[PDB]
Amino acid sequence: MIGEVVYQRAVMAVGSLTINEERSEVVDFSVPFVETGISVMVSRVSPSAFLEPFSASVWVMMFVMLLIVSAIAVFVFEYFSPSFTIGKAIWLLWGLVFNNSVPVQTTSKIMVSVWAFFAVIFLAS
Amino acid sequence: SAFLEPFSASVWVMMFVMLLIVSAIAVFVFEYFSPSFTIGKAIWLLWGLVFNNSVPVQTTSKIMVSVWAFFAVIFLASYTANLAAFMIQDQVTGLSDKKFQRPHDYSPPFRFGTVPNGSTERNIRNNYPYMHQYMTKFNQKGVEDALVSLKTGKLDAFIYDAAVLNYKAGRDEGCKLVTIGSGYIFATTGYGIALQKGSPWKRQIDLALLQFVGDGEMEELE
Amino acid sequence: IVTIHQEPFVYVKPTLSDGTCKEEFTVNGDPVKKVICTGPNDTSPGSPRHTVPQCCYGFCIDLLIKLARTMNFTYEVHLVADGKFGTQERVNNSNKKEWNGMMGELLSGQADMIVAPLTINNERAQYIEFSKPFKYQGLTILVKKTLDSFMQPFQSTLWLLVGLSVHVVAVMLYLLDRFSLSSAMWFSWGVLLNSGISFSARILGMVWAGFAMIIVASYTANLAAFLVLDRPEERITGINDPRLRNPSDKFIYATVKQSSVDIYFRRQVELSTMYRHMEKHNYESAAEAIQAVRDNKLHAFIWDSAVLEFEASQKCDLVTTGELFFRSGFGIGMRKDSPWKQNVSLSILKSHENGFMEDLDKTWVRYQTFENMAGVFMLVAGGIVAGIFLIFIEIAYKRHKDAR
Amino acid sequence: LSSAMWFSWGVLLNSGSFSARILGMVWAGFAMIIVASYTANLAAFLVLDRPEERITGINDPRLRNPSDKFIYATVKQSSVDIYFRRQVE
Amino acid sequence: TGELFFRSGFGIGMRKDSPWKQNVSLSILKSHENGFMEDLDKTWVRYQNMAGVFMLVAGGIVAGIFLIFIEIAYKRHKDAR
Amino acid sequence: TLWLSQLDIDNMAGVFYMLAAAMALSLITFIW
Ligand SMILES: *[C@@H]1O[C@H](CO)[C@@H](O)[C@H](O)[C@H]1NC(C)=O
Ligand SMILES: *[C@@H]1O[C@H](CO)[C@@H](O)[C@H](O)[C@H]1NC(C)=O
Numbered sequence: 023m024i025g026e027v028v029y030q031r032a033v034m035a036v037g038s039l040t041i042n043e044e045r046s047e048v049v050d051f052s053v054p055f056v057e058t059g060i061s062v063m064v065s066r067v068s069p070s071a072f073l074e075p076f077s078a079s080v081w082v083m084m085f086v087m088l089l090i091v092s093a094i095a096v097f098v099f100e101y102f103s104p105s106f107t108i109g110k111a112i113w114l115l116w117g118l119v120f121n122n123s124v125p126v127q128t129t130s131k132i133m134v135s136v137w138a139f140f141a142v143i144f145l146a147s
Numbered sequence: 148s149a150f151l152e153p154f155s156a157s158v159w160v161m162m163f164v165m166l167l168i169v170s171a172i173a174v175f176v177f178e179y180f181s182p183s184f185t186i187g188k189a190i191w192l193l194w195g196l197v198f199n200n201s202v203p204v205q206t207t208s209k210i211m212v213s214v215w216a217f218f219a220v221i222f223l224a225s226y227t228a229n230l231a232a233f234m235i236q237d238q239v240t241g242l243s244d245k246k247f248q249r250p251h252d253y254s255p256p257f258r259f260g261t262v263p264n265g266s267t268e269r270n271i272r273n274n275y276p277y278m279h280q281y282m283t284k285f286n287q288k289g290v291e292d293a294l295v296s297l298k299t300g301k302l303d304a305f306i307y308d309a310a311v312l313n314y315k316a317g318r319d320e321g322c323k324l325v326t327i328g329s330g331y332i333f334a335t336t337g338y339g340i341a342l343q344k345g346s347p348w349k350r351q352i353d354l355a356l357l358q359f360v361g362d363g364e365m366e367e368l369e
Numbered sequence: 370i371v372t373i374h375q376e377p378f379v380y381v382k383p384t385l386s387d388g389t390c391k392e393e394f395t396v397n398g399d400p401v402k403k404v405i406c407t408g409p410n411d412t413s414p415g416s417p418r419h420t421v422p423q424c425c426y427g428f429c430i431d432l433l434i435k436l437a438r439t440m441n442f443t444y445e446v447h448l449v450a451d452g453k454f455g456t457q458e459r460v461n462n463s464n465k466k467e468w469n470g471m472m473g474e475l476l477s478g479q480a481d482m483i484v485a486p487l488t489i490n491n492e493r494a495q496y497i498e499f500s501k502p503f504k505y506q507g508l509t510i511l512v513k514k515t516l517d518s519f520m521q522p523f524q525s526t527l528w529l530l531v532g533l534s535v536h537v538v539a540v541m542l543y544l545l546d547r548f549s550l551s552s553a554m555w556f557s558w559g560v561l562l563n564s565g566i567s568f569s570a571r572i573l574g575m576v577w578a579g580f581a582m583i584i585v586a587s588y589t590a591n592l593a594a595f596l597v598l599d600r601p602e603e604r605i606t607g608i609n610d611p612r613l614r615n616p617s618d619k620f621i622y623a624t625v626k627q628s629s630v631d632i633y634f635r636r637q638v639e640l641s642t643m644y645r646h647m648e649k650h651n652y653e654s655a656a657e658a659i660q661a662v663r664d665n666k667l668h669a670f671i672w673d674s675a676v677l678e679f680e681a682s683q684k685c686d687l688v689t690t691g692e693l694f695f696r697s698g699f700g701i702g703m704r705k706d707s708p709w710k711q712n713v714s715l716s717i718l719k720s721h722e723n724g725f726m727e728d729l730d731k732t733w734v735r736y737q738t739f740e741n742m743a744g745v746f747m748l749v750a751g752g753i754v755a756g757i758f759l760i761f762i763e764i765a766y767k768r769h770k771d772a773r
Numbered sequence: 774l775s776s777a778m779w780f781s782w783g784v785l786l787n788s789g790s791f792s793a794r795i796l797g798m799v800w801a802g803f804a805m806i807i808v809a810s811y812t813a814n815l816a817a818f819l820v821l822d823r824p825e826e827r828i829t830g831i832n833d834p835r836l837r838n839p840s841d842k843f844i845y846a847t848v849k850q851s852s853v854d855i856y857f858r859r860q861v862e
Numbered sequence: 863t864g865e866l867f868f869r870s871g872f873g874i875g876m877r878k879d880s881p882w883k884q885n886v887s888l889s890i891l892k893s894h895e896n897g898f899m900e901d902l903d904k905t906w907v908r909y910q911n912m913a914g915v916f917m918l919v920a921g922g923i924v925a926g927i928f929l930i931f932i933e934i935a936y937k938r939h940k941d942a943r
Numbered sequence: 944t945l946w947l948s949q950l951d952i953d954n955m956a957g958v959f960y961m962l963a964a965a966m967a968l969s970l971i972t973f974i975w
């Protein structure tokens with residue numbers, strides 16, 4: 023088409039041809055009306071779950087919060103004895119975080135057991 | 148009401164007879180698996196398998212209730228999903244309702260108005276005498292006055308042209324005003340164009356209008 | 370007067386031994402007016418054409434009776450021998466835009482007036498005059514209308530994998546017992562499935578808590594996917610649907626014959642590719658197209674909105690798609706020399722204004738588990754018998770071992 | 774007294790003679806309906822964008838219908854002014 | 863917000879009688895051919911609810927587990943004076 | 944304009960993470 027225009031065989035040409043330095047110098051052109059250019063075409067719950075793309079994208083504040091809340095619960099459970107810390111408190115907490123624990127069981131333990139409400143609220147959220 | 152089809156379980160056919168038979172089957176299998184007490188233990192285990200958190204109740208005979216527990220928890224999850232899918236979201240049903248005949252027989256006095264010197268009043272004059280007489284109490288000076296009266300609660304309904312009411316409902320601020328559903332128009336007609344009788348312009352005006360309708364030139368304007 | 374066969378409007382039935390039809394009352398209790406109508410037994414070509422008189426009735430004949438009562442008309446009902454609405458078609462003699470079908474019969478002088486669901490068309494209006502329409506309706510499409518995979522929509526091996534997880538904990542509990550039996554696997558199976566089943570206890574608690582949280586997370590992932598997501602599979606939006614705009618042999622759709630829809634498509638030169646595939650799926654009448662759609666021969670059938678919605682109400686297996694396009698209304702077509710145009714228009718307007726059309730609509734137009742859980746119920750019911758049978762077998766085996 | 778309330782809350786709040794037990798089992802079963810409804814309501818109110826989903830475009834009803842509650846304008850007599858002045862609708 | 867409308871391009875304002883218009887257009891086309899505009903865009907233009915409720919609930923529960931406990935302890939002391 | 948579910952691999956990754964955490968916790972019991 024460009025060669026046809028060059029040798030006076032075509033006064034006007036419209037064939038969706040591109041505009042570059044070489045074509046512009048050889049033959050004149052008017053104001054473009056459609057955006058175009060050089061591009062590359064390739065083939066087009068799938069993303070990551072249980073991680074930053076799913077929830078807790080920053081993945082630091084919540085990560086430390088879920089541990090410090092358990093630490094505070096263990097500390098207050100120890101302080102409420104007047105039971106014990108470390109293994110017993112950790113086992114009790116990890117048993118009360120969910121409502122399907124069988125081997126989990128005056129008023130201090132019952133008062134700490136209200137953390138099951140927080141656990142179920144967190145599960146619902 | 149409650150525990151019916153409107154409440155949940157939009158099917159409501161299979162489960163309302165399935166629950167009793169599955170409970171009976173569970174009782175029978177648990178009383179057969181003694182090598183126990185039917186009322187004292189079978190029903191308790193059935194309730195403990197229907198929902199996870201329950202009362203602390205207890206060879207492979209008692210082990211094999213895991214399939215029933217899995218079926219029950221799957222049924223509960225499916226019920227929750229169905230309720231979630233059903234919880235995501237109109238009584239005149241036309242001019243034949245009894246309210247238009249006896250507006251004053253209800254506890255709240257129904258107040259409907261029209262615009263006189265128009266087509267609606269002319270139609271209702273020759274079709275419903277007493278209804279028109281009651282309507283004359285709530286005459287409106289214009290479309291805007293009736294619209295603001297209906298929006299503010301002064302009027303309970305407004306009878307008028309279908310196209311104007313549809314336009315107002317579609318572009319209403321807040322979408323607090325709606326027409327009588329869709330297709331409930333009493334006297335479905337059209338606007339058209341008025342011409343003098345015997346004029347020689349109708350013979351081509353009608354053809355041009357029908358050509359425009361056929362060519363699709365009317366849709367974009369609408 | 371000649372009319373065309375249309376089930377929502379013109380019911381045609383064979384007559385009884387006396388040449389008439391049974392006198393019946395509608396659901397509302399009103400009499401069903403029927404008339405004796407002359408027409409061919411089979412309008413399709415290549416058939417033993419017999420002009421036996423059938424019995425025809427419906428909304429159109431009721432409107433005709435009303436018009437005759439209001440105008441002292443002595444109607445003579447006739448049926449279109451061609452069996453089509455008719456338009457300008459080229460059959461022979463080169464350039465010949467001659468009307469055929471009902472329009473051709475009216476123009477030939479055989480018919481004096483037409484009462485039928487005849488869509489108002491500009492080309493028809495050029496040579497015929499249409500009175501004020503008695504109803505308004507457009508064009509839509511008719512098409513036959515998720516959680517069957519109760520276990521897994523895909524990757525069914527997961528049920529095994531989580532089961533393998535039980536192993537990777539069961540053998541664990543034995544090891545702690547050796548460096549401190551047989552119920553570890555049973556408890557692992559029945560911990561989430563409630564059925565009543567120094568640091569070793571702590572490790573057991575933590576490991577089973579992790580297993581339980583993994584299981585509940587998997588169950589939430591599986592069930593929360595079964596949600597409000599659309600159950601229908603890509604319902605036709607309407608005339609602007611890209612699938613309709615891109616004709617293909619995999620998804621075929623066409624009209625019935627050279628009706629007003631065909632004329633509208635002919636005028637719309639944009640859908641040139643649509644016409645080529647449309648011409649290959651024509652049908653003799655609307656009933657054949659409806660049957661083909663019910664038989665899944667046609668993916669979708671484009672036709673008048675009123676007929677399609679009436680058929681959808683009558684046959685719930687087929688549903689209507691598309692909002693509205695080519696909005697028009699049925700009207701009475703008469704020759705330009707007929708002096709009844711003003712009378713017919715006034716009578717139709719008066720009848721529609723006085724609520725007669727509402728009564729006509731009510732009498733004729735206005736009319737009236739699965740693998741989600743039944744599959745798993747059947748599976749568990751079948752498995753219970755096998756389970757109790759194997760329980761009896763193992764009890765007998767234990768008794769034999771004890772006796773020996 | 775007081776211990777009975779804690780005992781009942783241990784079942785209601787998932788914290789872990791037959792005449793009372795038969796109705797207690799029904800109460801425990803119904804207690805799960807409350808939490809299921811709470812979870813369903815939270816999911817329904819969380820999956821839906823409560824505020825407006827931004828401006829769709831030129832044909833947005835907010836832009837096509839002027840209102841002091843939602844003001845919108847250009848800066849000055851720039852190219853946007855000429856582009857709008859070209860259109861008449 | 864908004865996908866796109868009134869798409870156009872930024873132009874170099876020049877007078878009609880200015881003889882540099884063709885040279886400017888050729889230079890711009892040559893520069894954009896090799897990606898100079900892309901490099902300039904990269905160097906100048908191409909630059910870089912749940913938490914709140916979670917924190918509120920965590921604070922509420924950690925406050926309650928102590929406040930309700932001390933209230934119950936005071937009640938026990940009153941009942942066992 | 945006119946012319947022109949269930950779990951995934953990361954769930955298994957999280958399962959691996961929790962299994963590793965459980966093994967790390969149980970190492971203390973094993974050595975004891
Ligand atoms: C309607 O017509 C009556 C005469 O019957 C007249 O008094 C009244 O002003 C008219 N109202 C309007 C809004 O034109
Ligand atoms: C038809 O209309 C004319 C004028 O409107 C009227 O004189 C005539 O009586 C009408 N025909 C019948 C049969 O009523």
Ligand SMILES: *[C@@H]1O[C@H](CO)[C@@H](O)[C@H](O)[C@H]1NC(C)=O
Pocket residue numbers: 440441
């Ligand atoms: C109806 O009109 C015809 C005119 O063709 C007349 O002979 C007949 O008497 C009319 N019937 C009645 C009931 O007026």
Ligand SMILES: *[C@@H]1O[C@H](CO)[C@@H](O)[C@H](O)[C@H]1NC(C)=O
Pocket residue numbers: 881882885
């Ligand atoms: C434009 O570029 C050409 C390149 O050869 C040059 O000869 C010409 O002088 C330039 N135009 C002006 C006004 O300098």
